[PDB]
Ligand binder design. Structure first.
Ligand SMILES: CCC(CC)O[C@@H]1C=C(C(=O)O)C[C@H](N)[C@H]1NC(C)=O
Ligand SMILES: CCC(CC)O[C@@H]1C=C(C(=O)O)C[C@H](N)[C@H]1NC(C)=O
Ligand SMILES: CCC(CC)O[C@@H]1C=C(C(=O)O)C[C@H](N)[C@H]1NC(C)=O
Ligand SMILES: CCC(CC)O[C@@H]1C=C(C(=O)O)C[C@H](N)[C@H]1NC(C)=O
Lengths: 387, 387, 387, 387
């Protein structure tokens, strides 16, 4: 049957380590897929780690990295959370250089985008077989979440962006049941920018915290009602969570507009806790080095700067990277609310390091009604490799 | 229970990428089977990729290739579509240097041919265990489809050829239920030649588009009625789909006879769409380099040359090869018709390249009621290998 | 539920190739267990290949072979028939340097013998967990079948030998239900010798064809009635099936006594067909090179020399070795009789070859009501290896 | 449903070999996890071997060992008992540098401790997903069993230690149902020390035999009643079972207090048999070389020195190490009592050997109502490795 997922996000005080694949270290001798963007999504039986592969393995000439991101070899695959992205325990999902996946309770729905930048194609899989298609609607790198989509009472939702990485772009919300598209919307957000949204269900609505690659240091936020009606803006909090960014000390939070002249960005997440908010962010304000998560009182609905909790998961002397959100199905947690969990990707090799390749590990963290001590669960690999 | 498969083929405007194994690239460091003819067949649960192995792995001395095609090491194995043909996720099907497989809805039926050329033997497996046998009936390399067979309401059908590769040969249609042969027919086709048929179910009849290795540039076609009564000939279309071939400009299509003095050939497919037809063909008219698929209006029943659609899946600067047909079970697609899908094998290494070995990758494409942009999902491997 | 297995063996005219692992070739680059005695047994779902491992992999220093047969590293493991004995698809059965296994229809029962030669211990596993034990009863290398045991209507039977390899030894028949021993017998056979029996069910009785390592060129035979009452002797046929052996031309068959002063031997099998008999034997009369199977008219009950069929499975220019018997569960074959199948082990490396290691491949053959052409499905590996 | 486990431990006369992974030997060429503390726990379907990994593989630079025990890469994983801890058949359990696991009959409950020594965190997983948390309660390396926990009628119990390795420390007993903590107790044991307890169910109470790292040569023992009421002390027997230790000849057993000025220790086990007791211990009184198990008459409740049985499982010329206890579910054994089983870890490489790495194999032994001959099932690896 279908996963209801109409409950509220559980109010957590800190997060506990779920898993850690240690893919890259293992990849020194094992046959591990040189991967990227290892997001986590769960079914009512297990949580899997999805990732993008370049058809090559670590420590192999084919990992040269000079291969473009959106190459024709890029495929989406997965493994049970915590398992390294190894060739022998991997499952083929879809052909993609940008994807998203979620389980509605019965079958798995993946969405892989592939094809030319000017006319990319997004194929929707369901049950391990393509069911529907979304063609580029603006001829400029059709892309999506890079993290779990959301299914509430059978219908699954996800957000896509078609347009430039700098200036305006066009965003849309797709809705689908059993692999087939049943509706969609255009998101009006002039002056605003949306990319790689980290969504989760909360009170029968799809809450996402995204990335502003145009002019946003604070992250855009968009609550999606089951009828595709929606609400867009930014995380109110008077504290910048995007990377790069300026000091918090110079940031006046804003609920409706981007702030900081910074233009670039990085994929992050955020979890609303009533009116408060758990926001994640690299420790470095410039490099993708370090990962932490702060709880800002009333920060979901106020330019609050009132930090009530802080917990580091990757110290600032270690490489961080992408990070996404997802929820534990109630059928696995046993709680009456949806436990909030996230993952931190850990990029190793180029550009910051001197190796011909580039990949990343990850650690998964979950809700918990306790306060968890700071620590660093970094990659640990030893570069350079045999090459 | 049994898969009905009595529905009509879905009318598609283009095809979307299903999967891509990237076996050869992976095989640079992984333990991938040096394989060939990686056809796809689906059960009411999953689609698997079948392939032939020479008992050797890529980057190993045993891949020397000097080993004959029809050697005693040739075994048929499989993996879930999209997965590389690796040793650790592979399943043993049957001993064969020519095979076919299909799922009737309950168990898997494979057919592997092995043995001496002059007295080869075809063993029918069902449930992962031999049930019946077909001995060479003409003493000249007994062979079969190299792609999915067809099961309609419990009974599965497939076509075999026993005789020379040039001149006439003898062809037959076998029918079987639960692994045991329940009937057969001889196909009268004097002047005509049949090899490696790509079949699919359509309106309770088995439609196949085959290969003419004698004198055919256009491909032979044979509709098989459930009672082994049948119809044979050629794809009508005024456009040559076999390789090698001459220009379309010099080809007068023919519904009943082969045309073009070309004698060799390559395994291809074709899908009837009402009266129209989706035909596949290497882009090069001589080399097995490039892959495309054209929709010819009324081309299934008329010497039509009226092209209504074209979509390249492997540009002409990349190696192509074999290609077959299959259908998505309605139990996976959800549609009320049978979605048409195919696979393109991508040969690397000898003969066109300077390496001691020879193998191939593949990409799977499926129906879809949308128009998909041209692109190239080629192998990508970097030859030569460590050797 | 339990597998009845009370039916008669199917009358076959020849055998068809079931599978071939190609382990050793694959083992050149893959991670394949350096193994030995790869017997096959089937459950009402699948047939698996059991084998003995020395805890080492091919192409690794640990394969040095100088390690004794009955070493403490010897463990019994398995894989689905046709799959190589690779580390990643293997299942742990029991600790053993001599074993046997059979499925009663519900769970798997394995029997592994390990320990010191003078006080070896045989542990009976059932459901993947030890249930009972048989201690050496004569203080001289307690050993067993090296091939499938037999289960009829829930109770499983197998034969063991405790004593010297030359002179007399003591033999016994054990019977067990759900992993626990429910009875046993001593086999009186003075002047006779029994080792590595190849058993199969036939008409509610357990028929075995064994090995005479004392003075037998013809093979001992022992029909076991469900009540442990039994019958022992030799294959009547006027043709020697053990290896080494003398010419058939100098062999006067004998139903009750061994013949030929040859003392050594090799594990073989035989299938009764009414009164006839299918006997297997290496082609060489001295080396374990080559494998063939002859059908002798009335040879099961008469000193017959009347050969009605011959089919080679491994030519005489290729290494052979052990060979065992088993039957296809009726739940897999679908027949009303028990299809007779066997396996031929193919030894490579020392002693006949110049490599530091020793292992073997195998091909599985099954019943079939047709006549199958002669051919050779030999190992194919290329020695020596990287070492 | 839930596993009752309210039965008494079966009275065994000796133990029989269950399995042996041969991980390290295999690891010479295979992709085996450099592991440690490979304890065994069983579900009502299978017994699995749990182990700790350092995110590295054998024969890889990452196995340098210089990495601290309680590093952030330490994760808990598992495989079906007897299988080596290889990357391709492993399952991710929890992030930990100290763990425990048990199956209540429905789902698996694992407990992994990770984090800083001064504020470590123990995450309880259930169903393959974190459910509850235990924070360090004394700020000094929060740790646990390193062997199977215990579930009786749905509720699972385990013991933890927070405090110094020498002097006093604080111990507690946790109880949990379906992954969530439902109660706990502080163990009063002044002058006494408790670490790495080997527990098992016996007569509806949890019996554990632990380690005294302070001043104990005899092992502490603690019977836990379902209501967290309990009983603590030491194995009465007038024979020392901890390592290092002095001679038995100088040991006056003690039921309530530690004896021998030895301070260090090693993880061992013990099984009560009525009033008797099966105690395990390294053969060497100083090195972790050798493994044996003695049955002391009345030794569970008397300073008895009356040895009734002895059986060596690893001779004294071979490296031994940790050892734990567990029980065969009645649903696997079929008995009316709980069969007692244990595992012996076999440490290879540093410190006793000259290699840059450190790991261990293991052999599993079980109850049995027979007397099993002495023998040595040691690791067998050949050090040093390629490195
Ligand atoms: C096209 C812009 C888009 C959003 C910033 O770029 C992403 C940034 C990335 C990055 O900043 O590391 C990696 C993603 N693979 C890429 N997405 C695609 C489809 O190429
Ligand atoms: C015997 C002629 C037959 C049809 C042309 O040859 C095929 C052509 C092939 C090819 O053109 O690449 C490869 C197939 N492995 C082969 N089939 C067999 C059984 O050897
Ligand atoms: C002890 C004699 C016995 C029967 C001849 O030897 C077998 C012969 C063998 C052989 O001839 O190759 C290999 C078997 N591994 C061995 N069995 C044991 C237990 O060592
Ligand atoms: C903190 C003391 C504790 C009990 C003696 O140490 C153990 C001894 C060990 C040992 O003696 O080999 C290895 C264990 N990995 C270690 N536990 C932790 C958590 O580090």
């Amino acid at each position: 049957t279908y996963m209801n997922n109409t409950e509220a996000i559980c109010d957590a005080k800190g997060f506990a380590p779920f898993s850690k694949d240690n893919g890259i270290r293992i990849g020194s001798r094992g046959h591990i897929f040189v991967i990227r963007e290892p997001f986590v999504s769960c079914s009512p039986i297990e949580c899997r780690t999805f990732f993008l592969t370049q058809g090559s393995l670590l420590n192999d000439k084919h990992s040269n990295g000079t291969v473009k991101d959106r190459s024709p070899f890029r495929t989406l695959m997965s493994v049970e959370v915590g398992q390294s992205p190894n060739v022998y325990q991997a499952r083929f999902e879809a052909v993609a250089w940008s994807a998203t996946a979620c389980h509605d309770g019965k079958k798995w729905m993946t969405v892989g985008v592939t094809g030319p930048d000017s006319k990319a194609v997004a194929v929707i899989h369901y049950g391990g077989v393509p069911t529907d298609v979304v063609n580029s609607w603006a001829g400029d790198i059709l892309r999506t979440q890079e993290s779990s989509c959301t299914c509430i009472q059978g219908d699954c939702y996800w957000v896509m962006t078609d347009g430039p990485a700098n200036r305006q772009a066009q965003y849309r919300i797709y809705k689908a049941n059993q692999g087939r598209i049943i509706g969609q919307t255009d998101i009006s957000f002039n002056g605003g920018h949306i990319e790689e949204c980290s969504c989760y269900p909360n009170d029968g609505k799809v809450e996402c915290v995204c990335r502003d690659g145009w002019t946003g240091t604070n992250r855009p936020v968009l609550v999606i009602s089951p009828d595709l009606s929606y609400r867009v803006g930014y995380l109110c909090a008077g504290i910048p969570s995007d990377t790069p960014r300026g000091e918090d000390t110079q940031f006046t939070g804003s609920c409706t507009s981007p702030m900081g002249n910074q233009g670039y960005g990085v994929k992050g997440f955020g979890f609303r806790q009533g009116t408060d908010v758990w926001m994640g962010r690299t420790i470095s304000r410039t490099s993708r080095s370090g990962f932490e998560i702060l709880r800002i009182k009333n920060g979901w609905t106020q330019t609050s700067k009132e930090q009530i909790r802080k917990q580091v998961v990757v110290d600032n002397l270690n490489w961080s990277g992408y990070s996404g959100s997802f929820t534990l199905p109630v059928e696995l947690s046993g709680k009456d609310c949806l436990v909030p969990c996230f993952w931190v990707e850990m990029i190793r090799g180029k550009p910051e390091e001197k190796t011909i390749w580039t990949s990343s590990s990850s650690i998964v963290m979950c809700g918990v009604d306790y306060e968890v001590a700071d620590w660093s669960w970094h990659d640990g690999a030893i570069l350079p490799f045999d090459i």
